[PDB]
Every structure is written in structure tokens, then in C-alpha cells.
């Protein structure tokens, strides 16, 4: 519904409800993760090599293949499994 | 704006434990390319002219 002959001073910089929108989106982003799986057992020593690719020595491979131990469903048995990751997710802990 | 990753990916379910599924990356089916975005040159130059004006 329109309003006529009415002058209000607006101020988007000292405005409220953008702080409340930020707080609501932060709390909602937190509230949509508590059902999901924590990746605590994944922090493990990764044996990584470059991906199978005809890579030049100048341009490094963005994707590194990584094989590692991983616990199975059974506590006694562990498996060896491989995956791919990016350069921006792995660091070189410290030949091999 | 158009944005794409052209690297085709295959997800792979690894069982962390009882009812714990982890989704790793499997094979790169096809070429290994670089993800990129595109914008039209003329429209971007025009909008930069507008914001300069």
C-alpha cells in the first residue's frame, strides 16, 4: 500500500536488519551442518603423487592424486584407498 | 556471465565407518582442462563506460 506526502530519512549504512540477515544466514549455515558427517578420521598421512597427465615442468598439476589408509566399517580392518585433491587443500608434511 | 568447470568428475563413496559416507573424486573422464568464466567484451566495455560516466 502506497504512502503519499511523506518524507522519511533513510540510511542504509547505519541500517539494521542487514546485521540480522548476516546473523540469520550464519546461524542457518551452522544449523544445516550438525546433521552431516564430521571428517575427523580423514586427517591422516596421504601418499600423494601427480595425476597421470602429460604435465610440463612449468605448469604444475592442479590435481594431486592421493592414496591413504582409511578405516572401514569394521574396526579391525583398514583399507587402502585413493582420491583426487587440489593443490589448495594439501600441504607437504615433513626421498618420498 | 558464463562459468564452467569442464573437468568431468566421478564421485566415489568411501565408507568411513558404520553409516559414514565420504565422497571422494574418482576418475577424470576426458581431458584435464581449467575451469573458467566468460563475459561479453562489448557489454563489459559498455558497462565500464557507464560506471565511468
Amino acid at each position: 500500500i502506497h504512502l503519499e506526502n511523506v518524507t522519511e530519512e533513510f540510511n542504509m549504512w547505519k541500517n539494521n536488519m542487514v546485521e540480522q540477515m548476516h546473523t540469520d544466514i550464519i546461524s542457518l549455515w551452522d544449523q544445516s551442518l550438525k546433521p552431516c558427517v564430521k571428517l575427523t578420521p580423514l586427517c591422516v598421512t596421504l601418499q600423494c603423487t601427480n595425476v597421470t597427465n602429460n604435465i610440463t615442468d612449468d605448469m604444475r598439476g592442479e590435481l594431486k592424486n592421493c592414496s591413504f589408509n582409511m578405516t572401514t566399517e569394521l574396526r579391525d580392518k583398514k583399507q587402502k584407498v585413493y582420491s583426487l585433491f587440489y593443490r589448495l587443500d594439501v600441504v607437504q608434511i615433513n626421498s618420498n | 556471465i558464463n562459468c564452467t568447470r569442464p573437468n568431468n568428475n566421478t564421485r566415489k563413496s568411501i565408507r568411513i565407518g558404520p553409516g559414514q559416507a565420504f565422497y571422494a573424486t574418482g576418475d577424470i573422464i576426458g581431458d584435464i582442462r581449467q575451469a573458467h568464466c566468460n563475459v561479453s567484451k562489448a557489454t563489459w566495455n559498455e558497462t565500464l563506460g557507464k560506471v565511468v560516466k
Epitope: 597421470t52 597427465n53 602429460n54 605448469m59 | 569442464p6 576426458g30 581431458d31 584435464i32 582442462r33 581449467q34 573458467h36
Partner: antibody
């Protein structure tokens, strides 16, 4: 019209510096890429590599140390040089022109392409055999 | 490969595809020089006959084949593949020999 004339000793002593020459017909050595290709008897061939003016001299990283390629702009020939001929070098050798091609599969500006090569013509070869 | 003359044959060679490939098909006469038939994936030059169908190198996870329709005794040549994969390194040796003979 082109056809090549291979020339070599054919009878080589072991642990020796081999040299080969390749006469041309019509098209000069400046214009085209050149390649040498070896093939043992009853075997698949082995691409030894390609040579061109202005540094385009990529060799096979199999040998990479005991082989050299060169041209002859005055006499208009193509020369192979080899170092330390062993028993696994007895083959038939070929000089051959070759043409490049850009296989492009992605963005050109991201170097997502590669230059393949293919040898269009061949010559008579030289049945190089190493024996003391 | 041994087929009846005047037929279509399919000859496979080389490793399975990983990325995009540019293949070269060569053929060899016994005692004589080699010779080109196919230079791109499905392109043939001038001076060569037709019906040398090349497999498209845009397929991921297949083998590079060579189809020849209406074969003859002049097609008795040891065939060679030379693949150039955008993912695999540069092959300085050719594929294994696939000898086509006729009855």
C-alpha cells in the same frame, strides 16, 4: 615433387660414431621440418626425432645424449649423427619430411592444445648393421 | 588380420583412450618404405585413396580403430598406429604391428 636419398656405411663397428646423409629432390632444407626414423627387422618403427632451423630440434629422450641431427643448406642434405653404436642399433633408417598439426581440445589461450607430427613422405632407407 | 578380398575389416591398435587423441595411421610394404594413410583422427591427405575410415579421437575410454571397406591384395601392408593423447606423454615408438593379409 620430393623423394629422398639415404646414404650411410651400412657396416658399422661397435662403439662408433655413425654418420648418415639424406639428399633431397626439389624442396630445400630450409622450408620443411625433417625427421629420422629407425626400425629393427620384424619390429615396429622408432621415431628418433625431428629437426628444423631456429632451434626446433627436439630429440627422443630415449637416446637424448648419443644422437644428433643437422642439415646441409649449401649441398641441401639432411644429416644424422650418432655416438657409440651398440648391438641394438642394427636396423633400417629413414630420413623423412613431416608436417605439424594443432590438435585443440579446450581454450586456446590456456595452452589446451598440442602440436602432433606426421611423416608424409619417406625414402629408401639404409640397412645399417653393426658388427665387428 | 586375414579377411576375404573386397570386404570391410576393422583393425585395432594402441592403448585405450584417456583424453582427446590425435591418431596417425601408417602402412608398410614388405621390404619397402613406410607410407601414410591417415594423419588426423578421420582425415586423409591427397594422393591416398578413400575408404580408410578413422575412429574419432573424441571418445573417452575406447580403442583407436581403423576401418577399411573394399579391401584388396594391394592392402597387404603392416599397419601402424601412432597416438597422441592430450593426457599421456609423447609416444616416440609406434604401436605394435597389425599385419593385414588377404586370401
Amino acid at each position: 615433387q620430393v623423394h629422398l636419398q639415404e646414404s650411410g656405411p651400412g657396416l658399422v663397428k661397435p662403439s662408433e660414431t655413425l654418420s648418415l646423409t639424406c639428399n633431397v629432390s626439389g624442396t630445400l632444407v630450409r622450408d620443411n621440418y625433417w625427421s629420422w626414423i629407425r626400425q629393427p627387422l620384424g619390429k615396429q618403427p622408432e621415431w628418433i626425432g625431428y629437426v628444423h632451423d631456429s632451434g626446433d630440434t627436439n630429440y627422443n629422450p630415449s637416446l637424448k645424449s648419443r644422437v644428433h641431427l643437422s642439415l646441409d643448406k649449401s649441398k641441401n642434405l639432411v644429416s644424422l649423427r650418432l655416438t657409440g653404436v651398440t648391438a641394438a642399433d642394427s636396423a633400417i633408417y629413414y630420413c623423412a619430411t613431416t608436417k605439424h598439426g594443432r590438435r585443440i581440445y579446450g581454450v586456446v589461450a590456456f595452452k589446451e592444445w598440442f602440436t602432433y607430427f606426421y611423416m608424409d613422405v619417406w625414402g629408401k632407407g639404409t640397412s645399417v648393421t653393426v658388427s665387428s | 588380420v586375414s579377411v576375404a578380398p573386397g570386404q570391410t575389416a576393422r583393425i585395432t591398435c594402441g592403448e585405450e583412450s584417456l583424453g582427446s587423441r590425435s591418431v596417425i595411421w601408417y602402412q608398410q610394404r614388405p621390404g619397402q618404405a613406410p607410407s601414410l594413410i591417415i594423419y588426423n583422427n578421420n582425415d586423409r591427405p591427397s594422393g591416398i585413396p578413400d575408404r580408410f575410415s578413422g575412429s574419432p579421437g573424441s571418445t573417452f575410454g575406447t580403442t583407436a580403430t581403423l576401418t577399411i571397406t573394399s579391401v584388396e591384395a594391394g592392402d597387404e601392408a603392416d599397419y601402424y598406429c601412432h597416438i597422441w593423447d592430450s593426457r599421456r606423454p609423447t609416444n616416440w615408438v609406434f604401436g605394435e604391428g597389425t599385419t593385414l593379409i588377404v586370401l
